[PDB]
Design a binder for this molecule. Structure first.
Ligand SMILES: Nc1ncnc2c1ncn2[C@@H]1O[C@H](COP(=O)(O)OP(=O)(O)OP(O)(O)=S)[C@@H](O)[C@H]1O
Ligand SMILES: Nc1ncnc2c1ncn2[C@@H]1O[C@H](COP(=O)(O)OP(=O)(O)O)[C@@H](O)[C@H]1O
Ligand SMILES: [Mg+2]
Ligand SMILES: [Mg+2]
Lengths: 319, 257, 246, 255, 253
DNA sequence: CTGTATTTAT
DNA sequence: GATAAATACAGACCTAAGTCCTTGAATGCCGCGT
DNA sequence: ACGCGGCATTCAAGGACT
């Protein structure tokens, strides 16, 4: 078909701050700031798909009213991460004179701010303070650690958290009711489980299920969206017997098409994040997994090395 | 509001080209006499004062005094956008946020309107008071620009030693040194080439090189430079216009021992 | 101090009756210290910097060979370094304002190349202030009105290497005729090595919560929000001595 | 075999310089009617369609259809190795490989033989669609290039609007905005300076500054450029040569 | 002492611009019979030798021979300090401390004075061996510079062939090939637009593109360049001034 | 950790 | 005024490696003015 | 024709890599 329909993530992107479901304290604080005015400098950080860009965009829209065209400067940090940007474009926008409602000021939105280079970030330090009376900067990034500490000092540290299953279920139910989709409770629960708090993943998976099969049922959602790799990897690592681990590997990972490097990397990540196993045993399994990773990266990527790694882990656990 | 129509756009183009390499932001005070403007250099060593009277404008109309904060690079680009023979009309509305430059040619019916967003510059309108100058000097502008450009290669300092009926410029640098001596002479045949000297007291002063380059960058404005010296006060460098001038107030070096 | 701020606001309102609205400004800039008696912590560093900048002219007459009683008379340039947000820039601005010098502020992160820094700051080192001369030179209370104090902020962001200007400024600051106040965040950096023996190091420390208790109580009383001093220590510990962030 | 001779060796120089920046890979296919060249930019935003005719060549001979692919960066380098007063000769064997360029002047006996290795470019679609565009206008190339280069400094997007005997070029950016208004006028004294515009429906679309600046590099070929516009159709930037034409098919932006 | 009144500052300007990007420090050996200048590059491939005679000076007087070390870039900066209708005067004391450059103008009211501080550089011995060359040709400097700049694009190795009254320049690159063929021609209407090929033995030599580009920088001195090829000796690249020569001895691979 | 520096307390 | 609490803070910074990225300096060609 | 004047392009040094 020549034309396409808009995705549900962008078509149903919240246009007001109330539609945002998660992080109730932060959303209420941003709504109070929007009503009262005098927006402070901030960095918004968290996981992908929990509503950081949407929150800042709704805040800017509501704060600036009809003046969003001029008062808002949109600059994807990854696209424009040079000191030249700060020297010319950001500085000229900050020195720009614009008549606004009393409380409100001009807003700079720098999405994906974690990718800004050191030079541009350091140059922004004085632009943040010199033109603060007229210009207010806003930062959105996946990881706040990439942003230098002095820049974090000048702004409010507003930190987001992974979306709870209840809020994702509420948003999914709202979209389902609005667009008349047939669903089952098991299917919605499975979509929430696969999303793992990423609302964007949940909505994309709902779109895929609806378009492909037409009914939101557990069977369809599992065929169209596979079970999360770390869970099968953890089940393989935490099996009681060696033969069980070998069987889980052969069936779920090797025969299904997962690569050796992916398997070993996910095993390392799961092992480092495991909590039931004591730290010493966890560390020695990490050692064995790292040896297997070294062999795979040197070029020996085979079922034999993965089985040997499982055998070493089981020997380590069996004392 | 304000509707100021220039006879020609090349005049404003050359004027803005005169002092865009020294100061980046200027406040244009548009009053019933005309547009007086002064802005401090970023190094706070040079001050540029510009006035253009109503006589320059074909039709100048102002309702209320307003401030025009502009960026020199953007203004230079906009004037570059227009042709030489157009009549440039500056139009501003109430509570100005942008300036509507109006290049228009009477020969054709082409009309080009460029809107320059007004920059918000906060600076004090420091007052300027004249004082008695020991040395008032006028030279051909081309020779002045040439000698400054020549000595600036050797060093970053220009030393103006006006001895009795003598004008000596000395530059001392790491690799070589240069000295130029100019003798006052007046020619009745060509008034432009003639050199005039007034010396109440002798003055010896040293000035920065890059500021002097930025000063002589305004050579296109006037054929004759207006140079006035005071030992403890900034030296006024003036380029005379039909209805105004381009003042340059430069700070000297420290004359240690 | 809350009552004093209310009186100041009333005087400002009367003057306006006779341009940015106060509530528009952020709390960091609206409660910025206007005099050196309001800076919280690092009192010894402020006193030492004030004494150095006051005796700079006397050391200049002595050609900087003599160190003096305090010892801050043999160094032409001074460096203020510490954790971010503790008040180095405010202290430098305030000591420059009190003693009557003309403040010239350059952001080294914005201007880090050899060419721009070289030209600008070089023609700034040995030049008087046209703003200082035209700013009522007639009264003789402030002789230092002509001269410049170049407070170069964000010195830690200059380009490194010989082609970088961070090593050029080391050669630059020893031959200057105006006070230089460099400010950086991470003094113990490989790029900042040329600067140990050419600058008067001044280590601004993290202020203790007791000093900022009064300031926080004042800004809480003014803004009609209730603050209990028992949680102020936890706020400072969480923020790690950063007054701006708290 | 192919033996194509240019009386003005600088003509092919100017044609290649017109679209050297736009594209690097072009298939110069030579037939009996003349050389036809077509290429697409890496971003796939501009289509270049060159059509040289036999009238341009002093002596043109093409025994069989042949497809000669080359790199514009290297070919332009080859062309800058000739003086103004020379005659170019394009030579290609029966099997297309290692095209030979000959710069010859007979007034002073000098010979310049240069070679360029051919390349296998698979894309040989060779399709252009003739459409009844909503508006067809013609203006001098110098004026259009001046307008484009003057408005490219304000922003990266230039908007062209066609209305009843009014042509407007609008560019709104971060430092400001600007709009140039011109009208179709006919001057009998100097026909070259006249501006024509035949409009059927109002036209409103925006183009990119980089591609427009790349297109106006072709102003060195012809003194007048014809521009045809239509609703959601590729803008046709046509430079007419003595024997043929050079057309730039621009794709507008999305509203 | 040394007193040399040059006919025009522009002439010495072109002589200096002949070898700007070639060498950085040179020592001008000043004697009664003109001035000599020799320089050797860091790659040990070219030998710049500059000889200008007394007849090239309007007035030249030097009783005591003096060594005059100078820096090229600062010398050019000094040269970029006078009008092109001015005459140059070189005046120095017996102490080799600074070199005084005097700009004299026809109107006696405009005088310019400049100085150039000397530097000490270890000079190298004179390479004036006149080994026999197989072939000798002379072509205008502008055409040769155009050919060199044109063929330097294809490849960094220049092939020059002279055999049976043919002159060839070949530059085989990765993208294609280049071959410029020129025959010797003598023109009565204009002498400078003539090619004088005098061959005694065939020559097949390979030369570096960058060094050739450096040599063709001296095209502003003379309208024609005299180029001599030898299969066992470095080729000579000579530009003929009013009463002097600028020579490059490029050692082939 | 150990060693040095600064501010409030005895 | 000296000696204790009470604590913030400095101890130090390398050479290779492959590839991408950025920033400033040095470089080139090309348009305008005289 | 002949010389500067910005502006595009090429070169070189520093930092980072989970
Ligand atoms: N000691 C202090 N007492 C009171 N207010 C302070 C203090 N330190 C910082 N502030 C506040 O924080 C604002 C910014 O202070 P700055 O001096 O800019 O911080 P900084 O130490 O320079 O760190 P930077 O700017 O990240 S390098 C001031 O305007 C004050 O409002
Ligand atoms: N808390 C939320 N409430 C409602 N929708 C959300 C929420 N978080 C994310 N979304 C949906 O995800 C889409 C894109 O999320 P986005 O805000 O870009 O993620 P990120 O915060 O990682 O940038 C939006 O269209 C929005 O509909
Ligand atoms: Mg986002
Ligand atoms: Mg600071």
């Amino acid at each position: 078909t020549l034309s396409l329909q808009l995705p549900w993530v962008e078509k149903y992107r919240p246009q007001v701050l109330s539609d945002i479901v998660g992080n109730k304290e932060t959303i209420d604080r941003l709504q109070q700031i929007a009503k009262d005015g005098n927006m402070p400098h901030m960095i918004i950080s968290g996981m992908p798909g929990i509503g950081k860009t949407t929150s800042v965009h709704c805040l800017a829209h509501e704060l600036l009213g009809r003046s969003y065209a001029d008062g808002v400067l949109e600059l994807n940090a990854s696209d424009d991460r040079g000191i030249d940007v700060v020297r010319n474009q950001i500085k000229h926008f900050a020195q720009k004179k614009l008549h606004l409602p009393p409380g409100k000021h001009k807003i700079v939105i720098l999405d994906e701010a974690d990718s800004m280079t050191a030079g541009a970030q350091q140059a922004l330090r004085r632009t943040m303070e010199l033109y603060s009376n007229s210009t207010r900067f806003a930062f959105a990034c996946n990881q706040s650690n990439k942003i230098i500490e002095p820049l974090q000092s000048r702004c409010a540290i507003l930190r987001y958290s992974k979306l709870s299953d209840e809020d994702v279920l509420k948003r999914l139910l709202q979209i389902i009711k609005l667009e008349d989709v047939k669903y089952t409770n098991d299917g919605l629960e499975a979509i929430i489980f696969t999303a793992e708090g990423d609302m964007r993943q949940a909505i994309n998976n709902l779109q895929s299920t609806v378009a492909g099969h037409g009914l939101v049922n557990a069977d369809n959602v599992f065929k169209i969206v596979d079970s999360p790799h770390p869970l099968i990897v953890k089940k393989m690592l935490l099996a009681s017997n060696l033969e069980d681990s070998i069987q889980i590997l052969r069936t779920d990972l090797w025969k299904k098409g997962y690569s050796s490097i992916d398997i070993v990397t996910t095993s390392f990540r799961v092992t480092k994040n495991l909590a039931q196993v004591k730290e010493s045993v966890r560390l020695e399994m990490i050692k064995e997994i790292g040896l297997t990773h070294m062999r795979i990266l040197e070029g020996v990527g085979t079922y034999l090395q993965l089985a040997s790694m499982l055998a070493k882990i089981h020997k380590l656990n069996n004392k | 509001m304000l509707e100021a129509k220039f006879e020609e756009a090349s005049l404003f183009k050359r004027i803005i080209d005169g002092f865009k390499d020294c100061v980046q932001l200027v406040n244009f005070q548009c009053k019933e006499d005309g547009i007086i403007a002064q802005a401090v250099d970023d190094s706070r060593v040079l001050l540029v004062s510009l006035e253009i009277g109503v006589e320059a404008f074909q039709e100048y109309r102002c309702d209320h005094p307003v401030t025009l904060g502009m960026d020199l690079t953007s203004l230079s680009k906009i004037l570059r956008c227009g042709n030489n023979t157009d009549t440039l009309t500056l139009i501003a509305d109430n509570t100005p946020d942008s300036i509507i430059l109006l290049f228009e040619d009477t020969k054709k019916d082409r009309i080009a309107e460029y809107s320059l967003k007004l920059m918000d510059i906060d600076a004090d309108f420091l007052k300027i008071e004249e004082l008695q100058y020991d040395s008032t000097l006028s030279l051909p502008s081309s020779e002045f620009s040439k000698i400054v450009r020549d000595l600036s290669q050797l060093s970053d300092s220009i030393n103006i030693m006006i001895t009795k009926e003598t004008i000596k410029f000395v530059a001392d640098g790491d690799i070589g040194s240069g000295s130029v001596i100019i003798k006052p002479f007046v020619d009745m045949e060509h008034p432009e080439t003639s050199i005039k000297l007034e010396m109440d007291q002798p003055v010896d002063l040293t000035f920065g090189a890059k500021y002097l380059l930025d000063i002589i960058k305004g050579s296109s404005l006037s054929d004759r430079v207006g140079i006035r010296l005071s030992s403890e006060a900034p030296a006024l460098f003036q380029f005379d216009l039909k209805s105004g001038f381009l003042q340059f107030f430069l700070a000297p070096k420290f004359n240690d021992e | 101090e809350a009552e004093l701020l209310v009186k100041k606001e009333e005087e400002r309102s009367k003057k306006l009756a006779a341009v940015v609205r106060e509530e528009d400004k952020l709390w960091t800039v609206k409660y910025a210290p206007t005099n050196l008696q309001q800076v919280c912590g690092n009192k010894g560093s402020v006193m030492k910097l004030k004494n150095w900048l006051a005796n700079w002219e006397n050391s200049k007459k002595n050609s900087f060979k003599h160190a003096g009683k305090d010892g801050s008379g043999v160094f032409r340039a001074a460096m203020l370094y510490g954790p971010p947000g503790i008040g180095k820039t405010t202290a430098a601005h305030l000591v420059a304002q009190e003693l009557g010098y003309d403040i010239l502020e350059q952001n080294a992160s914005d201007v880090r190349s050899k060419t721009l820094l070289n030209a600008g700051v070089k023609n700034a080192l040995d030049n008087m202030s046209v703003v200082g001369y035209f700013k009522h030179n007639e009264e003789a209370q402030n002789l230092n009105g002509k001269h410049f104090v170049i407070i170069m902020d964000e010195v830690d962001g200059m380009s490194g290497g010989d082609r970088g200007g961070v090593g050029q400024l080391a050669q630059f600051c020893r031959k200057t005729s105006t006070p230089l106040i460099l400010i950086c965040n991470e003094r113990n950096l490989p790029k900042m090595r040329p600067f140990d023996r050419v600058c008067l190091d001044i280590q601004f420390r993290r202020p203790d919560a007791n000093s900022i208790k009064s300031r926080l109580m004042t800004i809480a009383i003014r803004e009609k929000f209730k603050l209990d001093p028992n949680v102020i220590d936890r706020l400072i510990q969480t923020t790690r001595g950063d007054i701006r962030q708290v």
